[PDB]
Amino acid sequence: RFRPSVVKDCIHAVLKEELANAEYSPEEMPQLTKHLSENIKDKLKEMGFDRYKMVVQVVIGEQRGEGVFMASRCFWDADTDNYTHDVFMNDSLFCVVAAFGCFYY
Amino acid sequence: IILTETETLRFFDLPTVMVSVESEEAEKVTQRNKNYEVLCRNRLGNDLYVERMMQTFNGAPKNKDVQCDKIIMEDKGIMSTAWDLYDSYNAMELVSLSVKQSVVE
Amino acid sequence: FVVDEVSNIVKEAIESAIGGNAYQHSKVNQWTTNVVEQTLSQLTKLGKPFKYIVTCVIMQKNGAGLHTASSCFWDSSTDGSCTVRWENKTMYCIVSAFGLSI
Amino acid sequence: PPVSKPWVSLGSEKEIEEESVTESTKQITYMISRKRSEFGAPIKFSDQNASSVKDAYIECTAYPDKNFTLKQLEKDVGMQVIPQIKDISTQTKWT
Amino acid sequence: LLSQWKHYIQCDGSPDPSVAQEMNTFISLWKEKTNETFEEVIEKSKVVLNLIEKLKFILLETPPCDLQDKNIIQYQESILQLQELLHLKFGVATEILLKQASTLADLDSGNMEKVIKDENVTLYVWANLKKNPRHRSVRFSETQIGFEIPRILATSDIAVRLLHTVVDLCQFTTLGGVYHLDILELPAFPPIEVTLEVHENVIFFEDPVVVRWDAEGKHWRTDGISNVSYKPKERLVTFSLDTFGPVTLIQDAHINMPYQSWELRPLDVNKVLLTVTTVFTEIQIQIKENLCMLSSIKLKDKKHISILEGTWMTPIPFIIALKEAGLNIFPTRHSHFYVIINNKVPLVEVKAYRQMALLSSAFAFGWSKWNLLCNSTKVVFKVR
Amino acid sequence: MCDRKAVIKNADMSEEMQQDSVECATQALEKYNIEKDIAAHIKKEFDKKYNPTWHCIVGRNFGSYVTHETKHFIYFYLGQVAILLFKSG
Amino acid sequence: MCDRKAVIKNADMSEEMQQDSVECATQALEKYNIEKDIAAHIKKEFDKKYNPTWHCIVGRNFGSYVTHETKHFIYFYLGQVAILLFKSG
Amino acid sequence: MCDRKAVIKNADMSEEMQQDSVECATQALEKYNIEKDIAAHIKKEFDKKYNPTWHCIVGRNFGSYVTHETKHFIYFYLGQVAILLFKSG
Amino acid sequence: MCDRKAVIKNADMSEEMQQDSVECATQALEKYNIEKDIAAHIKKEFDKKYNPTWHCIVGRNFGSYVTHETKHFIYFYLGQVAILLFKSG
Amino acid sequence: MCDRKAVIKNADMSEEMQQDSVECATQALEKYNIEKDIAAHIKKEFDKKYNPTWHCIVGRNFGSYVTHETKHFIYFYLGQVAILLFKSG
Amino acid sequence: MCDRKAVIKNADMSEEMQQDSVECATQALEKYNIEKDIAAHIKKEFDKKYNPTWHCIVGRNFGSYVTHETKHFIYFYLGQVAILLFKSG
């Protein structure tokens, strides 16, 4: 079964590992977000959720005093399918990672 | 398979700071900035920025436990057979006629 | 999962909820709610055997950069993803809808 | 003695009604029935990277905006503990 | 009370509805039970109607001197709560069926049609899945009941539902139940033509008047209804509605309580037969001990087979059953306002009927035409 | 009037409102039969005349270890139905 | 008019708009049940009436360390609900 | 290892500590047979790990109406034993 | 070292001083049991860290509408205790 | 009045309510001849008077092993009719 | 192996557990010629398999009125012996 707290802990571990010294740069940054989304997806594979489709979304942006809102309304089977998220935020950027695990019948 | 719409799932909420100079709130912004600078400059009257204590009074929670009274649980078996019925009746009539004969003397 | 149909539904929900309104963070939460609620309602009215995951990003246009990337995992023949970016003079709205067959 | 004055609404409840998030539609529930023999189907799942699909990544580029040079110090933010006092009801399952 | 005990064992001996604590326990179990199907709601609706009927029997059989006002209002509130919760559970089960069947906005089914027929509730649901403006005649299969929806309703995402369960109600009676016509949202405004079928248990001696329920006024009204046409051979009522809602067919409340003649003759010492001949029908009723039964009906000198025939029951349920079947020969206190009667003194009537029943075991009594011409203080009748 | 005797088992209360809890339980068992509805009636009534959160446990077989405010614990039997009512918040 | 008694705990202003804070807190407790809303109403009206630089916080279990202006600090109870209101701008 | 399946009925929780509540109830059912000691074990372990002022109700026939702080409510079944664990205070 | 997980609900800082808000609260929860002293420790430490115009509230059931400096707002849960840290001025 | 002497064989009961079982059996045999209706009349009167969790077995040849509440087991003879009345629930 | 047929007169159970009642009754009739020991065998087998508080009535003349839990009732004949099995408690 998809465990949101363990998935959140692993997501937080990767976010703290990678984004601790990361500043804003639009040149390196699309590749960085694609790599982060793929890496979070692959580590949720390595956790090993059987018969579970995985949806990972990463939204990172510049910090300048801006106004951001991230939220989701979704339509799943509430007994088997579940979700989590994490937020990293430093001097130069903000990062949001959302994970949605959906059991397949 | 039951599929249900989930609730509000907020993942991130960053309030803005950057308000445009062309925005309608910009003059309120500038007046608030000037008032905050005036406050940060002036400490005239007594201790103008005196730090004060306050604390809500609630709680004092103590412990007593409750266990319901256990209904005592007993198995029992009976014998409803007509032969036992007639034998029992013969036994009580025999003991009644036995005890009825001792009062004459 | 029709990507064009999902994109049209997402665009209709964004235009119905946000509109031509300027940036007000007191109303950003309500706009975020209404966009994905309308999108989810229209996807369920389509009623194809898909679990739907609809997420919204709403971003003030102050010059700060933003992006959205999704690396996900499914049966690629049946399930699909559709991300739509919308903007006005003051807003960015990036809505991602994922349909996953049952 | 100070008489308890009648409360006079002063317009700051209107912005609360603006700020309050209300769900426009009821929660929609769908039931789908499938035969048990079709459950436990063989799995054909594949990775979809963000670099593999054009729609999987969307970027808003950064630009120096001279309009947003007015550095306010003054954002009004509201928060609360997760709502409802939660007077919830539980009952044992009665046969 | 003993008959309550007996048929309580025979029909619902397991649930135990007769005690008020277990009645509130039933309210409790219906609140606990979720996702109730229509068949489950019907199966418990039998218990609901049994409880309402028992409370009505208590209120009508227990004398008002022995009935406390608290008891009367408690039983009436229990009846109203049972009716409202029962209709709410029918609505919940109908919503469950609608969300089971409709599913998609279009469903790829063309036009969903569902007819469910029960003893008390008859349901017709049609869904506009195709949204075809050219299809405006919604006719349910195997019935002539239908609608003629406008083009906007034929293009809209609607379902039309029929649920067959200021008008002076002292002058007019509601007959055939209530037809709840509704436009529900599927999960310039011409009147909609509605064709309905009259209930077979109701005899309309005239054309029924179509009235609609002003829910804001909480009364029946004759406005908003046009194109009223009645086919008595097919028992079909066609009428145009400006706005859908609860709709019922009414007739004047006092039409057949007046009659021509009567005769109470003894069959045995413990049995009599009362033959009452009206303008429309001759009703023979057999009275034995505490039970009365509908012996025979002669509808214009033609024998009519009724469901109530052959069934013995206590006098007040006999009156209720005949009134519900439409064989109302039991007048009310307001019946003299709308019926031409030869009003006698109530004390003279009470004494005369007491001696009538005392001598009814061996004497036959017949209607006298000189009763009409004797005054109020006196009564004239034939004896043998 | 259901003749169910109130048997006080554990009560750090004052005596006036112990009668209030007994009367509220007597009213709640008369109208309701679900133990959570009885717990709904007793707690909500105690919410209107004392104010803080309150917690009511009604049933015939339960064991509890709860933390209550001072002068705010009562546990009693109304016949064979055990009502636990403690205030915490 | 909910008769919630105003028990002023720490008063550091003039009496006129101590009454206004009591009156303002009465408005929010009647139309709202969420303490964020009660904090939002008193803050912004005091922003509207006594310069747009105030701060309000409302709740039942909260103890602060705050910086205010002299002649701009109150903390009071309207019934049980504790309301702290201070200007720091 | 007693094969008693955890049937979650209502859980305003997080999922890791849904497992902790199930594991602690499994240890409490295995170690104690009186429901007051089972409620003592589950609540006290949730006092040390997730702060004080928790409440545990353990039984087979009880109906409750309880006020809990948010993300701190679970009510589940371990076999035929119903465990109500909510936090207030 | 109490295992109270730091859950951040709303943050407008850097990671250097989101973590500073986490550790100073962890020191303040351990040192003080009264929420006013916990808020006293948090604001005093951050008055000497990021200029002496901060404000702190420590508690469990409250709501605020506060005005904050750029890059100087955070609201997080240290286990069950809700702590706001905003700088005004 | 039928002179059916009551023979008490096994009564985990009280003395006043042994007589209540005998008298309720006396009216049940007098009113009803079918043993399932005799069991119906005895059970409900015990359901109404004490608690609605009784069970009644009426017959001449039946061997049972029933689980009863203590002070709630009777098995007696009324003529040639054996009546087992036990409470469980 | 005696060919004692099982005709099910009344059954509020499931099919796999009605069959277990039939098979246990067939074993109980084989080993025990006494109806209470037949009833003791069927009930105690059902106590350990489908939880306690079962009741078994075995005999050749009995009219009963019993309260049973849902999906826990049967009344059936094994040859000429009617065996009544219900769960309550």
Numbering used by the authors:
A (entry chain l7): 38 to 142
B (entry chain k2): 238 to 342
C (entry chain l8): 12 to 113
D (entry chain k1): 154 to 248
E (entry chain k3): 91 to 255, 373 to 394, 431 to 627
F (entry chain l3), G (entry chain l5), H (entry chain l4), I (entry chain l6), J (entry chain l1), K (entry chain l2): 1 to 89
Tell me, in the authors' exact words, what the paper reports.
Ciliary movement is generated by the axoneme, a molecular machine consisting of microtubules, ATP-powered dynein motors and regulatory complexes. The prototypic axoneme of a motile cilium consists of a cylindrical arrangement of doublet microtubules (DMTs) surrounding a central apparatus comprising two singlet microtubules. DMTs are organized into 96-nm repeating units, which cryo-electron tomography (cryo-ET) studies have shown to be a landscape of interconnected dynein motors and regulatory complexes. In total, there are 11 dynein motors in a single 96-nm repeat unit, and they are classified according to their location (inner and outer) and the number of heavy chains (HCs) they have.
To investigate species-specific differences between axonemes, we used our cryo-EM approach to determine a structure and atomic model of the 96-nm modular repeat of human DMT isolated from ciliated 2D organoids resembling the respiratory epithelium. The model clarifies the composition of human RS1 and RS2, revealing simpler spoke heads, necks and bases (in the case of RS1) than in C. reinhardtii. The simpler architectures of RS1 and RS2 may be compensated by a full-length RS3, which we show is built on a base of CFAP61, CFAP91 and CFAP251. Our model demonstrates that human IDAf and the ODA are even more structurally similar than in C. reinhardtii because there are fewer additional subunits, including the α-HC and equivalents of LC5 and FAP120. One difference is the direct contact between the TCTEX heterodimer of human IDAf and the linker of the IDAa motor domain, potentially providing an additional signal-transduction pathway between axonemal dyneins. The only difference is the absence of a MOT7 equivalent at the centre of the T/TH stellate structure, even though the human genome encodes a potential homologue (TEX47). By contrast, human IDAb and IDAe differ from their C. reinhardtii counterparts in that they have HCs encoded by a single gene, interact with a DNALI1 homodimer instead of centrin and dock onto different sites on the DMT surface. In humans, IDAb and IDAe are positioned in line with, and closer to, IDAa and IDAc, where they interact directly with the tubulin surface of protofilament A03 through the DNALI1 subunit, rather than with a regulatory complex or docking factor. Despite the different binding location, human IDAe still interacts with the N-DRC bulb, which has uncoupled from the baseplate and shifted distally. Our human DMT model contains around 25 proteins linked to PCD and 20 others associated with either PCD-like phenotypes or male infertility.
